[PDB]
């Protein structure tokens, strides 16, 4: 199952602080994974900010999570060798109604 | 620029409808890519739904975008790792 992959992966927003469902960014660092640092969103409140600027708790902050692909050094002893893996990650929070 | 990769991968909700910044999923299919189908999201309204369920043109639906890694079949004359920006959903913001 070991294929060769060519690497072409070579190459702001305050929404986190201005959202009705604002969040803080937590560092997911695994020195054995590419990408090494994935900034995940942690919803600041269980509810959402109202016009008055207070947390209305009859609405809910929830996190939008996407399954993403990552490379992990494997076998760990061997460099230039990796395995493909799927990880779930929070990208941001939105505001929803319950029921 | 090449690396060896084991391609054995190692491992719903209606938020899109219940959000003050709701959104629809547009199919992006590329038979040469893994993932073959990526369901991108488009903010339905330019503004957000208020308490009563009407739209406020002062609050704004914006898309949450993230760079994701994808594999593309290397032409006959195996695969290449690339990064694409995608929209996963919309949130509501104020200027």
């Amino acid at each position: 199952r070991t294929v060769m992959v060519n690497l072409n992966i070579h190459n702001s927003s305050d929404y986190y602080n201005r959202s009705t469902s604002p969040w803080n960014l937590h560092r997911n660092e695994d020195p054995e994974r590419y990408p090494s640092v994935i900034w995940e969103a942690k919803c600041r409140h269980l509810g959402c900010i109202n016009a008055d600027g207070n947390v209305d708790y009859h609405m809910n902050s929830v996190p939008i999570q996407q399954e993403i692909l990552v490379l992990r050094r494997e076998p760990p002893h061997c460099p230039n060798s990796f395995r493909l893996e799927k990880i779930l990650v929070s990208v941001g929070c939105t505001c929803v109604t319950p029921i | 620029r090449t690396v060896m990769v084991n391609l054995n991968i190692h491992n719903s909700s209606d938020y899109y409808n219940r959000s003050t910044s709701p959104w629809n999923l547009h199919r992006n299919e590329d038979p040469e890519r893994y993932p073959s189908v990526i369901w991108e999201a488009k903010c339905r309204h330019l503004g957000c739904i208020n308490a009563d369920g009407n739209v406020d043109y002062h609050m704004n639906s914006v898309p949450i975008q993230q760079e994701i890694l994808v594999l593309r079949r290397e032409p006959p004359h195996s695969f290449r790792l690339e990064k694409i920006l995608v929209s996963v959903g919309c949130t509501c913001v104020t200027p």
Partner: antibody
Amino acid sequence: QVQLVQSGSELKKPGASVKVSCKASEYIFTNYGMNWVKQAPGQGFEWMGWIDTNTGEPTYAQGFTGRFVFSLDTSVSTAYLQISSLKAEDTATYYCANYGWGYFDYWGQGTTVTVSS
Amino acid sequence: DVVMTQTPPSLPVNPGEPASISCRSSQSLVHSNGYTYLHWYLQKPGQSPQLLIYKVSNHLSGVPDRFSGSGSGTDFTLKISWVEAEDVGVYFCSQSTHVPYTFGGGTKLEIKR
């Protein structure tokens, strides 16, 4: 050099159900999973749909929404076609075919399902 | 459904002489990604079907050049040049640009005598 080895010939009475197997010699990395094709006697190939060998999610062609279930057991690298309320039209040879990167690459030998009173 | 009109239904060929099979699409097989998902498959007598050409002209590692794919949009053609005895079987096209995937009726290659 992967080989898809399908199950075996089946005889069934009208109203019954059949589950056909398609086991792979080895793992197949694909952006799209296994596809299923019906060939009635003396007729052409008709696409039934497919199942993602990654998610397990099936997708059924307009012909085959009701009495048709695609399923998968990765442990033994095998896929399964199930047909219920077997009718006469269902008498046919059914083939499993891997699809990846925009085309079918490997096909099973086909399984013949005969519906008879 | 995209209809695949494949012809001829039967093709008797003197061994060493060529064979030409044609596939017509009821609409363009040009995908939005720019590629054309028109493929040619052969089922040799008493055997599982096998791939010969994919994406109009692309060959599998084993297929010899004597097998050639050509075409664009709604018109496509497979050519077998030095028809041997191993070639006897049913040749058929698939388009998978469009859902549902569809298939030509088939052409049966038999040796002429």
